[PDB]
Every structure is written in C-alpha cells, then in structure tokens.
Symmetry: D2
C-alpha cells in the first residue's frame, strides 16, 4: 500500500540518474541527501516535475540532514570521491580510493544504526567490496540486508558487447563476473550463454572467435577507465544497475543478480565480502548461490578476494 | 512513424486476448477477423475502450471480409477448431485436428497472397508444424517471413514450474523445447539454466532432484491436456507467447525465440517445418539457430519430426 | 515489500481478463475464486505461465473455497449473472438482475467479514449501485474501503468516441458520467474537455457538432446493449477499468476516478451509493469530490439516484 | 519495423538525460553529437550498457561529425549556452542568450537541409521561441515538421505544484501556459482543471485559495531561476518533456501538447513562433489549436509575443 521510502545517501552523478529512474518507474518516495549545501534541493526540484511526464506519484526532496534517514526502506550509498587528487586520468585506479572514502562509511553507518536499522542497504562507493563490509560493520544491519554494486554492472558490459557482435537482444546474453569489482574481476567464459545456448556453440560456428572474445574481455575490464579517459567516472549504467537491484527488493522480484555479499564458507572464504550470484527478494538476500568452480576458476576467485583482503588491512 | 497494421485471422479465445494485449502495449492497429457474423465487431468495440485505461492509441475493429487483410504488416492465424467432435476431454489430442482444420489453410493462403504478400505471418492452428507449412505453400511468402507458435509457449511452462521449485524470477530460468509442438516435444535437460547457471549445479546442491525434474517434465508435456480437463483449450499463455513474437518483429528486438521454421538441412532434415531457436527482428527471421545436439538428443528430434512428417502425408 | 494479495470473487469473463492484466502489471498475487468446480484452476494454470512473457512474479491459483479470502488486500466481486433467463438480447436490461443476483451479496459479505475485514473491496455485480451497498451492509467494512464499478467504464466510452471524432489521444479527453451506472446515467456536457480545453471551443470551431455529440451520447448509454447484441455482456473494458481502480489503491496513485460510493449528504442525498468523482489512494477512498452541479444537472442526478432507490426497495 | 534514428544535436546536460530515457523506452537508435571532442563517445558508451537493464535494443554512439545527421528521423537541438559570461546566478535571464547562441542555429540549419530534410525537429536552445524560427528558416523544413520546447515543461511545474497542494495524481491536473517560454509566460487560470473539474470549484470549497494559487504561479515562472540558483540550468524535466514530445511523433500518439509553433493568423499574429496547444502525431504537427481567449487573456498573449518579436530584431 504505502510507497517505499528511498534515501540516496550521496547526490552526485549516480544519485542524479537514480532519482530520475525511480520516478520513471514510480518506485518510491525519494530523499536526495548530500553534504553539499543547496545542490540536492535543486536536483530534487527538477526531478520532481517529471512526475507529470511519467504518470508517477513520487515525492522528490533534497536534504542535508541525516535525520531524513528515519524510516527509510531502502538506503543507497554513493557518498565519496570518484578521483584521487594529483592523479591523472591514465592512473586512474579504484584502489587509490581507500584515501578519500574510508571515514565516510563509519559516519554513515552510525546514523543508519540509529535512524533506519530495518532498511535494505546498497553500497556503491569505491572500492565497494571493502566499503560494503565497513558499512556493514558500523551499521549493524543483518547480513541478508546489505549488498554492494558489482556483477550487474560489470556483466552488463560483457553482455552488451557480445550482443553487438552476435546481433541479438542484449538481455538474451547471460554471463557471470564474480570475485570483486575492479581490475581483478573474474570473467567466467564457461558460464556464458546466448539465448540460453553455450557460447562455445557460436564459436564452433564461427559467429565469433576466441580472439574477438578476448578482445571483448579486455574492453570489459577496462571500460570504466576508457570512459574516465573520455569523459568521467561512469554514472548512467551504474545507476540502472543499482536500481534493477533496488527494484527487485521493493517489488519482490526474486531476480538472480551478482552482488557483493558476505561469504560464510562459500568458495572456501569467510569474514569477507565478494561478488557472486544472489537472489534479491522482499526479505532482502533470499539466497546466496555458490558457483561450482573448477580448479582454474577458483584460482582466479582467490586472487580477486586477496586484492579485497589486502586493501582491508589498509584499515 | 505509422502504426503497424495487425490482422488477427480468427477471433475466438486466443484472438480475444491477443487484441487486449496489443492495446496494452500500444503495439499497432488491430483488425479482428472471423467467419462468425457480428461476434468480432463486439469483441473489437469492447476492446477499443481500453485505449483510455492504457494510454494507448490503437484502433480496434471487427471484420467478416478477407478484404481487410489489405496492407497488413502482421497476420496471425488462429482460425480453426480446438478439439474434435464425438471426442471426450480425456482423449484430447492436437493430432485429431487434421480432420477439423486442413482446408482452412488453403483458403487463407490465397487471400494472403492477394492482399498482403509482404506481411510477417504467425500460424497457431493445430497441428501447428503441419499447418504452418501448408499456409506457407499456399500463401507464397518467403521462408523468413512465416513461423509457427510452439517453443515460446512450451518453454514458458517448463521455465515457470522450475522457477516455482527454485524460488526465482521465472524469466531467470532458460530452457529449450524443440522439434515439434505436441506429445513428441523434445525437452532438453542439458540446455536448462537458472540465472545462467547449468541446472545440474542446483541438482548437485540438492535444491531440486532428478525425480522432481522428471515430474515437471511430464507436467510440461501434458499441460494443455491438464487444462482442457479443468476448463478449456489454453488461450491466455498462447496469446502472450504469440504477442512476444509479434512484438520482437514490430520493434526489431532481435530476441532469440523457439518457433516452427522451415529447415533446409539443419539437424539433417529438409522440406519440413520444425521448432528450433531462431532470431526475430525487423526483417522477420534474421537467423535460424541449429542446436549442436548429441546422439541421444538427435534421436528425439527425429522422432518429433517424423510425427510431423506422418501427418503431412494425411495430406 | 510483500506483494499485495488479490482475490477475484467470481472467475468468469471479467475475472479472466483481470487476472491476465494483473500479471502484465506485476500487480500482486492472484486467487481466482468461483463456485464452478475446476474451471478457475484451469484459467489460473493458463494464466500463471504468462509470468515468463511479462517478466512478472505473481502467483496465480484457482479456488473453490471462501477460505482463500484470508488476509486479502484487495477483493473484487463479479459473482453473479450477466443476463436473465427467458429474456431476449434486445430486451437486455441490468435491472432484471435483482432476480438473478441479490442473495449472493449476503453470502459473500459474511465471508469477507470473517476472512479479510481490512481489504479494499470493488463490486461489479449488476445492478452495481444497489449491489455495492448490499455488500457494504453485510461485510461490515468501512465506507472508505468499498466502491462500485461505474464511471471509469462509462467515461472510457465517451472519452474514446469523442477522441475518434477529434483525432486525439483518447487519454486527452476528459469527461464525467455520474449518478448511476445504467440507463439513467448522467452525462455532463459541461464537464467535457479535450486537452484540458472546454468541448464548447471545438464546437464553435466546427470540429464537432452538437448533433454528433448527442449521437455519441446515445452510443455511450447503449454501448453495453450494442455489444450484447453483437456478442456478449462486455468484459475487456470492464476489466481494465476495475484494474485501473485497484492499481491506484495498491500503488497509492491518488487518481481521481468516478466510482460508486456512499453519499453522506453530497448532492442532497444519503444512505445510498451513487457514482461521483473520488480519489483512490493507499488508504482507500481518500476523498469524495462533490461536483457543483447546476439546477438542470441536479435534476438528472436525482433521477438516477431514484432508480437506484427504487430497486433497493425490491429488497 | 526499422527503429527510428534519433540525433541529439548537443550532448550536454539535457542530451545526457534524453539518451538515458530513450533507451529506457526503447524508442530508437541514438547519435549523441557535439562539438566537444571525446565527451560524447563516453556518455554514449556508458548509456549503451543500460540496454541490458532496460530490455532494450537501441544503439547509442557518439559523434563529432555533422555527417551523422544523414537519414535522421528525429533531430533534437540543445546546442548552445545555458549562462552568459560575466553574469551572476541572480541576473540569470534567458534573454541574455541571443549573444552566444544565435550563430549556432544558422550552422545547424545548413546541415539539416543537406543531411535530413525529412526529419522532425525539436528545438530547445534558448531563447527557444526565437531560435526555433531561426532554425526553421535555415533548415527549410516544412512548418508542420518543426516545434520548440515550452508548454510541456512549464505546465509540468504548475501541474505538479497544484497536485501537491490538492493531494492528487500529478497527471490529473491540466493547465495551459502559452505565448512564449520565458518571464512573460502566459498562465491561464481559467484553463486549469483537476480531474477534469474547473479549479474554481476547489477554491469555492476552500481546498486551495486564490493566494496560494498566486504563490504557485510565481513559483512556476521563476522555477528555472530558483533551480539555477540552487544548482544549475534545469535539465531532467526539460529532458522528459522533450521526449514526451518525441515519443508522440515516433509512436503516433496524437497527444495534445503545448509547443512553440509557427502562427499563420492564430491569435491575430503571423510570421512568428508562439507556444500554443498542438497535436503531435506521425505526420508531425497534425493540428494547431487556437485557444478562444478573452480580452484580458489576449492582452497577455500579445505581450509575450512582443517579447519574442523584440529579440527577433536583435538579428
Ligand atoms: N560499485 C561500482 O560498480 C561503482 C561504479 C561507479 C562508481 N562507483 C563509486 O560510487 C561513488 C559515487 O560515484 P559518483 O559518480 O556518484 O560521484 P559523485 O562525486 O558525483 O557523487 C558522490 C557524492 O557523495 C557526496 N558525499 C560526501 N560525503 C557524504 C556524506 N557522508 N553523506 C552523503 N553524501 C556525501 C559528495 O558530495 C558527492 O557529491 C564513487 O566513490 C565511485 O567510485 C562505484
Ligand atoms: N500453437 C499452439 O501452441 C497452440 C496452443 C493453443 C491452441 N492452439 C490452436 O489454435 C487454434 C485456435 O484456438 P482458440 O482457442 O482461439 O480457438 P477458438 O475456437 O476459440 O477460435 C477459433 C476461431 O476461428 C474461427 N474460424 C473458423 N474458420 C475460420 C476462417 N476460415 N477464418 C477466420 N476464422 C475462422 C472460429 O469461428 C473461432 O472463432 C486451435 O486449433 C488450437 O488448437 C495452438
Ligand atoms: N459494473 C459494471 O460497469 C459492469 C459491467 C459489465 C458487467 N457487469 C456485471 O458483472 C457481473 C459479472 O460479469 P461477467 O461477464 O464476468 O459474468 P460471468 O458470467 O462470465 O462471470 C460470473 C461468474 O460468477 C460466478 N458465480 C456465481 N455465484 C458465485 C459466487 N457466490 N461466488 C463466486 N462466483 C460466483 C459464475 O460461475 C461466473 O463464473 C455481471 O452481473 C455483469 O452484469 C458490471
Ligand atoms: N526550451 C526550454 O524550455 C529550455 C529549458 C532548459 C534549457 N534550454 C536551453 O537548451 C540549451 C541546452 O541546455 P543544456 O543544459 O543542454 O546545456 P549544456 O551546455 O550542458 O549542453 C549544450 C551543448 O551544446 C554543445 N554545442 C555547441 N555548439 C554545438 C554545435 N553546433 N552542434 C552540436 N552541439 C553543440 C555544447 O558543447 C554543449 O555541451 C541551452 O541553451 C538552454 O538555454 C531550454
């Protein structure tokens, strides 16, 4: 009956598109929160009018007070920095972001614990796989109520590139990128299908070659960098990805999506967050799916988790 | 710019739902044709009013003249009988339909050749794999411009049942049923994925058993009969399935869908229509996808094709 | 988070389309209830498969027990007869329906009181303005939680016909038909706009004439009869209209819709249900809007209410 | 069948949201064109991935060459400046934009005439009512194939503000703001309706007062300024508005929308563009609607057109 209340903790580039999309889908009431005075109210005022064009009925208001987290059903955290100062577009790496972004999670976690402990939480702030757990530790929310953005966005790239080469509906391509969001992303060739058919079949048929696939792989891992060098840290697709995830929770869709979640033994790991297929429903994370990886694949997973494990010690 | 013109050749149970769905999706102008006097004009009047509730702008008119096929962009043929005089609901079989519906194809084909030779055609009339080729022969349209309903409907059942057992979004289950629509339908266990993951992984995990899967199989094959025995020849899912197909042609979606199409050597067969994955886009059938079947799977394919072959001889 | 639970009390022609539309819009879980054995389980099985084609996640099950009303969020009552034994299609009149459908309301009301006292209820069963108050009396629900189908359906016809004549989007025509659903329906010329512009301006411009408008009026009033005479009691538009209403409650849309509601002094009447603009939101009927009618318009209102009053006495 | 080809001539803030929205609605293939090297390709790459999340199939590519206008079905012109240099947020006025924006139209018109003379054109660049005609003069396209952004955006504000005060679905409020986009906007109190009911009725009922309406009026005329002072020149709602207009053309919706169009006698004016209700269909502007204004209202219209007429002489 009541509309879900959605709090965008951070109203920069991603938060802007997220608000637009939420109204388009009439998904819930929106608070656009930020540290920067004024900006949020303006983005919110602008976004609010689209209610007419979209046949929607969602309030959109800006905020500068953590008090607006009260009674939140969904909280989305994009608070932080894209770049590190003194670095050039070339040297862009998500790693160099522990610097300006670690403290922010501590703060935000405190307020969440006090204002909306029953909310479902999605963390985006880089380096996500580390930040997600930090926020989880400070917010006190249950393990099934917090996830980080990753697979959905990374696979959307791989899915889309394959679809262009094969000339089919992008949604018709399925793929899995697990372990961690970042340069050690694990792309699983064996788990790629097109129209439900193993990719190998298309290679045997010479519709696509192993090399063009490898090319596509490279382009997938380095896409954020390619975009950073062309314009700025990606924000449109990140937005759609997060919202596909939020929507699955709010509408209880029970979609299978690859998100950063807490491992309790899966893949032989514990006390850390890693990307893997999950099911997002109205109870939050309904189920975590463990891919039955082979020897070589496990090795890759292990390496990505170590990269997350290493930065963790950096605080 | 102009709206597509869609002609439903047959306006019974399936035609009724198709028209409703077309207005919902603002998919194109609709002519509801039938030989029964007046009935279609009423269904059409009723349906036209939903343009208001759906924010659409599609005309819906009834017809009793083949003249209305003129300039059609899409023609959907459901004309015929759902079952067979002197027959009980328990002995229901789409095969006893050669009696009831052969001649109708010849008549309709002639008018199509005359009024809309460039239309995309979808045949539903059972037994579909035979009927579609008959309409193909008398209408004269190119092989990439005509398909029969089958896989989309059969897999929706298999996908749905599995999804109930696994507790995931039904769209997240992918599966293939090929060869023929009917009792000899080929259900390919090896081609089933959930969230892009091989079904075998969920069986290994004890999420679903081989036995439960086989039961789901029997259910899938006997679904039409189960519904006939509870109410009547199924028509809501058949309609949605057809519209998914028509929509992919009208909007140039390029979805991979399993439909009855003319085989020119694939799977070792020719001069006959059989169900297989294919791509539907703005040009019609953009590509036929031949599954690289193993020896066991090929055997079953050939048995389904043989049933189609047998009925074809009954002329 | 949880999906709304929707119970269709009656699963004939209108119930069938309602269930289809609910899946299309992923609006909630559906129970298709009826007294006819087996029929609803079949319609429900058929309908459930469309979850795949529609990217939805709504359960659809049949029922023959009032037990399934338990915890319903929305209940829609279509239970009854569409016409009347020994009567011809030409003498069709929603009034001869007191015979056919009074007692059914008492029975249903009792079970509602027992199983789902907090549900939002929509009555369709003709003659609706009488039936809705009967169900209101026996079910015990609050006045803001029960309405009858009428204005939304009647105006969709008037809006559509005008839109055809003027060549505009049907949603761009706005109009009001109040008082009662039936032959005494009050069509208010003064309250007609096109793109927010008074209809009179288009008449002054010679875009439509007074005569054409009056013809459109006769058509609007006699639409059900025209369709009965061509096919059967209308059900596709009635269904879309009901779902528009249910959707505005479930998604908290706060749309202004004309429904049958309990009058407590508005228009000079009380202790009776009559059609008038109202707002449907998450709380149910959020506000009843009383049109500031002139002397001529009031006269007509009173005549419609008197017809409802007369039939009420036939107990 | 084929997808519409849509060229965004200008890829700044508005162009960015427009591309996002087009993919969401699967409305057509997109070229994101601009003078600034690199930026466009990046925004395009980013936007392209959302195809997966949105079930869409639209190509999104960047461009720096006017050659990409070839075969365009829709061209949208946002090319230019928001601000004037040396001016503060306080002194922001759309007038001070003849400066940096006039020449741009000449250029773009030449290419349009040579690359896509059959396209439908929407102009946004401020001051729109002047720029639209300039572009019309240089492009040579027919009067029914070119319009400027105005009413839709300005009314969305008025509609939304009224809806908040009255607590109804924003789409349920209808209003007209004609003459010119800018500080002399003509807000027509007499043409405001809520749920199709004259606003006066709600004032008589004391649901809203004349003063709060006047307040709302002020806020409507100064909204861009309020947003400019809070963040930046509005871009989200502008985007949705333009796209509602584009969509009506591509899907042949025949919606009634207030856009800047060429007057040939209407309201007693000629050889100039002014905002007024129009119908946008697949032939472009199907009809221009002349509001039958009264003496006071005409005076206001005349004043807004003079403001457009004055700036025209400024070149
Ligand atoms: N997980 C992923 O796949 C992925 C993808 C893209 C970006 N990201 C990350 O997401 C984050 C957001 O990116 P963006 O494009 O929105 O950048 P952005 O700079 O445009 O927006 C971030 C906003 O956070 C605000 N902020 C700072 N402290 C805050 C506080 N504690 N509370 C609320 N807001 C606060 C800043 O004002 C800033 O506007 C970045 O750190 C980026 O690295 C992650
Ligand atoms: N392909 C599939 O997977 C599948 C699934 C379900 C049903 N079907 C088949 O589709 C057919 C139609 O099903 P339905 O439920 O709509 O049946 P229906 O009986 O309700 O409708 C059939 C309509 O065709 C009409 N008709 C007869 N001859 C005609 C002619 N020459 N031109 C136009 N109309 C004519 C009948 O009057 C009737 O209205 C049946 O044969 C059924 O077996 C196929
Ligand atoms: N409000 C309106 O504007 C409007 C418009 C059209 C029709 N109607 C009315 O709605 C009613 C239903 O229309 P329909 O076309 O779906 O009719 P229908 O005959 O196809 O369906 C009515 C169903 O109710 C069932 N039924 C009988 N008693 C029942 C009970 N106690 N509990 C549950 N089900 C029971 C019947 O078996 C049947 O399936 C009719 O009275 C019709 O006049 C109203
Ligand atoms: N009509 C309205 O209701 C309305 C509302 C808002 C904004 N606007 C106007 O729309 C225009 C666009 O606003 P914006 O927010 O997109 O600003 P923006 O600066 O972010 O985008 C404009 C882009 O035009 C580009 N450009 C310059 N010359 C070009 C050329 N000839 N070809 C292609 N691109 C070129 C610039 O690189 C710039 O990025 C502004 O002039 C603004 O005043 C009108």
């Amino acid at each position: 009956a009541p509309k879900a209340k959605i709090v965008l903790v951070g109203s920069g580039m991603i938060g802007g598109v997220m608000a637009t999309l939420i109204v388009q889908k009439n998904l819930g009431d929106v608070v656009m929160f930020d540290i920067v005075k004024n900006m949020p109210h303006g983005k919110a005022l602008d976004t609010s009018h689209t209610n007419v064009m979209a046949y929607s009925n969602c309030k959109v208001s800006g905020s500068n007070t953590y008090d607006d987290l009260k009674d939140a059903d969904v909280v989305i955290v994009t608070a932080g920095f894209t770049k590190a100062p003194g670095k050039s577009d070339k040297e862009w790496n998500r790693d160099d972001l522990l610097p300006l972004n670690n403290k922010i999670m501590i703060e935000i976690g405190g307020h969440i614990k006090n204002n909306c402990p029953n909310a479902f939480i999605i963390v985006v702030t880089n380096p996500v796989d580390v930040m997600v757990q930090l926020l989880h530790q400070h917010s006190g929310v249950p393990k099934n109520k917090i996830v980080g953005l990753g697979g959905v966005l990374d696979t959307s790239r791989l899915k889309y590139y394959i679809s262009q080469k094969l000339n089919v509906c992008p949604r018709d391509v399925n793929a899995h990128i697990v372990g961690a969001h970042g340069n050690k992303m694990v792309l699983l060739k064996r788990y790629i299908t097109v129209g439900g058919i193993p990719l190998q079949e298309f290679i045997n048929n010479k519709k696509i070659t192993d090399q063009e696939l490898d090319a596509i792989f490279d382009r997938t891992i380095n896409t954020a960098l390619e975009i950073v060098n062309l314009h700025a840290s990606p924000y449109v697709a990140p937005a759609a990805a997060i919202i596909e995830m939020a929507e699955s929770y709010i509408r209880d869709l029970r979609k299978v999506l690859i998100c950063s979640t807490l491992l309790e033994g899966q893949y032989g790991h514990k006390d850390i967050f890693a990307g893997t297929p999950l099911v997002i429903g109205g109870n939050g994370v309904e189920q975590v799916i463990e891919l039955q990886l082979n020897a070589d694949e496990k090795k890759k997973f292990d390496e990505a988790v170590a990269e997350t494990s290493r930065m963790k010690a950096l605080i």
